[PDB]
Ligand binder design. Structure first.
Ligand SMILES: CCOC(=O)c1cnn2c(=O)cc(-c3ccc(C(F)(F)F)cc3)[nH]c12
Length: 206
């Protein structure tokens, strides 16, 4: 694996952003986190992140046991919290086979599920490949609220302390055959002021 994606499904873009209200006058947007995928990746042993994701039911541990392991990834984000209009999230996946996807996103706090978002995306055949777009989806209110509180902290190390207990688990399944296609675990730190968002993608091995 050389990127976030498998033989059956590749992540092309993900971004979490805000467009200030004056973007209508002159467009701009702030990216909190961003992955653009328009030598193999480093690996991380899954035991090292087991605590950040509750055992619970159908958690990282359970899903990873069912497999296949080449479908499991860890993304480390350095979020850019240096920026009040539209808060949005955009995702795009690609595949060679025609499928209907169910994308489940679970937000955890202190290894306890807080909110869950589930959506179904159908394929658009474009240039011999199938594309799945969910663009400009409104960011869930819990995380818009979280970002506002998070930016109020006076110290970067306090934001990292808070973000230590904050994880997202994203599961993409083939809706018709129910087989898992992709599972990404996301962990978070805050980027320093001058640096924008950054990420590091790893394969989850055990
Ligand atoms: C990481 C993968 O996320 C998703 O797949 C997804 C789906 N709905 N969704 C939101 O409705 C808000 C965020 C988000 C909001 C804020 C931040 C952060 F800036 F705090 F890091 C990160 C993700 N993320 C998501």
């Amino acid at each position: 694996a050389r990127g976030l994606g498998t033989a059956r499904l590749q992540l092309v873009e993900f971004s979490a952003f805000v467009e200030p209200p004056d973007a209508v006058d002159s467009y701009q947007r702030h990216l909190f986190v961003h992955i653009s995928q328009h030598p193999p990746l480093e690996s991380v042993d899954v035991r090292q992140i087991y605590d950040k994701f509750p055992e619970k039911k159908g958690g990282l541990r359970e899903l990873y046991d069912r497999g296949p392991p080449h479908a499991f990834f860890l993304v480390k984000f350095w979020a850019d919290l240096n920026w009040g209009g539209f808060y949005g999230v955009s995702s795009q996946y690609e595949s060679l086979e025609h499928m209907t996807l169910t994308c489940s996103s679970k937000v955890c706090s202190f290894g306890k599920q807080v909110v869950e978002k589930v959506e179904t995306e159908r394929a658009q055949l474009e240039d011999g490949r199938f594309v799945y777009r969910l663009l400009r989806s409104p960011m869930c209110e819990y995380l818009v609220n979280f970002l506002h509180k998070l930016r109020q902290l006076p110290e970067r190390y306090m934001m990292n302390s808070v973000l230590e207990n904050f994880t997202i688990l994203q599961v993409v399944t083939n809706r018709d055959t129910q087989e898992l296609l992709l599972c990404t675990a996301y962990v978070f730190e805050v980027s320093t002021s001058e640096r924008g968002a950054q990420h590091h993608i790893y394969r989850l091995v055990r």
